[PDB]
Amino acid sequence: GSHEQFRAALQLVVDPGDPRSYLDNFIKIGEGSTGIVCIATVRSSGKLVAVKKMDLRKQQRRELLFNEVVIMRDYQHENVVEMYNSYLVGDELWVVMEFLEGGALTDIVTHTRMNEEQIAAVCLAVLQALSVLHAQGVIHRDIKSDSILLTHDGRVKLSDFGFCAQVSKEVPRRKSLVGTPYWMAPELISRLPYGPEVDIWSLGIMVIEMVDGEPPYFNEPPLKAMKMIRDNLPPRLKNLHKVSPSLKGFLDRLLVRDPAQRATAAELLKHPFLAKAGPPASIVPLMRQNR
């Protein structure tokens, strides 16, 4: 009944029907937290959408599938990927969403060197999303360059809420070992009760990606890296001398070991470093087709 129960539960939240009957010409474009992502054409209108597809039978933790469709149900923000609908297709949960044509930030940080104007623009956008998400008690729990998608004109959206979690008065903190190792907050690796603060640390690591091209310890096996994150001082930038005093001071508010001292998203929105933030157009030349 285990499988049948998850199906029936999903059936009670997803939209009715088989979306395959309304979509043409599927093209696989990626792989996320809990399933693959494809784009396709909405036949009636000619518009392109993306679809995340999560097989119930290939999950380590099936209850994660509730995250996008329960926690993130009809969530709307200029810096969050817009989801349209969800469906149950055989054993797969499908989430139909807008197509972000600029791809992911990962492709940018692995192939180019962002300037601080571009870095600030990305941070500002993510912090705006996080302040609102955190205000509602949602923790993303997998902030990294992979989770950042871009429009053609350089606007930035937070993506892949497959691992997100809800806190509340009754569940003030989460405890589960969730994330991507190199980006994990120290308190989360130490298996202490944690909150929204973990997203702030992870953003700090994403800043290190934007500067160094990869998170710290990236060439170590993941378990060793987590041990190193857990036990050592905050990671240093390899290219510290290429970073302005403003960027450093900003980053120093993020990579704080003690989560109680770590700046919050709302606090960070006031940081002087973000005044440097360029417009959406500044990001454009970094994209693959433009470089």
Ligand SMILES: CCNc1nc2ccc(C#CC(C)(C)O)cc2n1-c1ncnc(N)n1
């Ligand atoms: C870089 C490949 N594209 C891609 N990978 C994804 C993984 C997870 C989610 C995701 C997710 C949710 C928001 C359902 O949690 C979305 C992904 N996308 C992508 N690419 C272009 N447009 C769109 N919309 N998505």
